């Protein structure tokens, strides 16, 4: 679940760092380009992001595991609102994404649905 913390935040990109080798190897499949992470913001809000870049480094004795993500919206309460104007503060955990949030994203109405995949 918990994945890492944010290092650098900008309206264009957000940089997150992986805690340890163990955590990254446990959830390496979930950390690929195009998949989804959520970054907390405050105590109840979340900022969903999509991974753009991965860059893992062990030059000499320096373990670096940096992801570059891009916000796509904010999860206030139990509802989803699009936008990229929240900018989560540094040292803020990254929590992966559960199935409930993703299902709530693609909800819409109950009559105009169209299952495509």
């Amino acid at each position: 679940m918990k994945i890492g913390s944010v290092i650098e935040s900008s309206p264009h990109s957000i940089l997150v760092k992986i805690d340890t080798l163990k955590i990254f190897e446990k959830a390496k499949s979930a950390l690929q380009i195009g998949k989804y992470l959520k970054i907390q913001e405050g105590n109840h809000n979340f900022v969903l992001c999509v991974i753009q870049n991965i860059k893992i480094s062990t030059d000499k004795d320096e373990d670096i595991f940096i992801l570059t993500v891009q916000p796509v919206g904010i999860f206030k309460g139990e509802e989803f609102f699009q936008g990229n104007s929240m900018l989560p503060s540094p040292t803020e955990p990254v929590f992966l994404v559960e199935d409930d949030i993703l299902n709530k994203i693609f909800s819409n109405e109950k009559t105009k649905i169209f299952h495509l995949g």
């Binding site: 405050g42 105590n43 109840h44 809000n45 309460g77 503060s89 540094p90 040292t91 803020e92």
Partner: protein
């Protein structure tokens, strides 16, 4: 079998609400109302009393069926038996789709034929007290804890046959201490109440959730003040605007289940904006014996508060503080119950001596680890701890139960009175519990 006193209190509360809403509707200029005034308590020092009235009505009927207003009138007469000093202005309110609106023909004979009631419940409850029996056998039967069918039949026959008088001045009660007006049903008048309230700017749902309950409670609280001369009101439109400001000022203390589920709710969505900031100082003023099972659940509540609002090492830079209302002792047992659960707190007390410097210290933290010296401050309601609180003011102050907020400076402090019954309610109001 629930006690009938609780049902009577519920009926009195319903009357208080409907009469308050009537006063709000009629609040145009110089009303000077005295809503309610009896809570079935001991002291009645200042009267400020309307009555303990009830509003009951069946589904639908042209006339008042039979034995309908017998319960309220019997209770009113029994209460009048111990009523004196200033006049108490009794009334009875009801709804009927097709009836005479106003005072009904109520002079003498109605009560004489109501007093001729022959119900077992009525006799056991109020008729016996109002009209004492003239037989020692009936007196003994009434006082028995258990009554049989034969005893009840003998009782009923004796009351129906024997003519029993009473010492209460009935005609005095009818001339002044009663009135019966056929009113309108305020369940269907909610829409009209909202429409009348929808005359200022306001909003659509703001009146429903924020303004109407606040007006109802503020008007209902006009008579609970100890001063009896505080009901002076004139130019009700001006006081309506003043209450418009007051509703935005307080924005809490809702009585009924309006828009609100479980036991308490709807105040949750108003606390969320403040409960979403990391670096905020939140002080809690809790009153134990107001919360059920406080001893066995305070520690778990503290743990669940700190694992949500004091988890981050760099963003959560403010230490919570829980000022309970107990003695200087009883803090050692809480400290022991926290140590056994691996939670670091500071009390500021070494035995019975308080230390100013030990309560105002900022916890030293190490960011490479996840170490904070202490995660909360828990002390009693003494004067020195209140002085410490005033020295280092908070951003939000939550009052749980009834605690004297005096001696606390409120320069830039948001007071948030939270009435609750258990810790599930408090968890749900602080957004650490999705459901009840």
């Amino acid at each position: 079998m629930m006690s009938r006193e609780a049902d009577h209190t519920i009926k009195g509360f319903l009357y208080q609400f409907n009469k308050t809403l009537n006063s709000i509707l009629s609040s145009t200029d110089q009303d000077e109302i005295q809503i309610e005034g009896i809570i079935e308590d001991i002291d009645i020092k200042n009267s400020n009393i309307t009555n303990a009235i009830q509003c009951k009505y069946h589904e639908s009927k042209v006339r008042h069926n039979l034995s309908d207003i017998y319960k309220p009138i019997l209770q009113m007469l029994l209460h009048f038996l111990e009523n004196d000093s200033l006049n108490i202005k009794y009334a009875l309110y009801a709804y009927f789709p097709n009836e005479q609106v106003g005072v009904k023909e109520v002079t003498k004979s109605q009560i004489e034929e109501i007093l001729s009631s022959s119900n077992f419940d009525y006799i056991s409850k109020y008729i016996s007290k109002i009209k004492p029996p003239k037989e020692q056998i009936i007196k003994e039967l009434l006082g028995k804890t258990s009554k049989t069918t034969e005893d009840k039949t003998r009782i009923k026959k004796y009351y129906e046959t024997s003519k029993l008088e009473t010492i209460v001045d009935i005609d005095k009660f009818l001339r002044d201490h009663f009135v019966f007006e056929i009113g309108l049903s305020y369940e269907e008048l909610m829409n009209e109440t909202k429409n009348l309230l929808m005359k200022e700017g306001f909003s659509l749902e703001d009146v429903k959730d924020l303004f109407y309950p606040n007006s109802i409670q503020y008007i209902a609280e006009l008579s609970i003040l100890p001063e009896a001369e505080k009901r002076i009101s004139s130019k009700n439109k001006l006081i309506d605007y003043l209450k418009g400001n007051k509703k935005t000022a307080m924005s809490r203390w809702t009585s009924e289940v309006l828009t609100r589920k479980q036991l308490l709710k709807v105040r949750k969505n108003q606390l969320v904006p403040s409960l979403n900031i990391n670096s905020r100082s939140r002080y809690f003023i809790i009153d134990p014996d107001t919360i059920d099972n406080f001893d066995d659940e305070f520690i778990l509540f503290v743990k669940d508060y700190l694992d949500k609002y004091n988890s981050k090492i760099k963003l959560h830079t403010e230490t919570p503080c829980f000022i309970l209302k107990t003695d200087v002792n009883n803090l050692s047992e809480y400290h022991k119950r926290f140590v056994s659960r691996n939670i670091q707190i500071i009390t500021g007390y070494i035995g019975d001596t308080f230390y100013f410097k030990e309560f105002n210290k900022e916890p030293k933290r190490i960011i490479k680890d996840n170490w904070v010296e202490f995660k909360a401050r828990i002390s009693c309601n003494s004067d020195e701890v209140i002085k410490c609180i005033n020295y280092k003011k908070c951003d939000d102050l939550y009052i749980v139960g009834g605690v004297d907020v005096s001696l606390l400076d409120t320069a830039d402090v948001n007071i948030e009175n939270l009435e609750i019954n258990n810790f599930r309610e408090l968890k749900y109001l602080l957004s650490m519990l999705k459901e009840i």
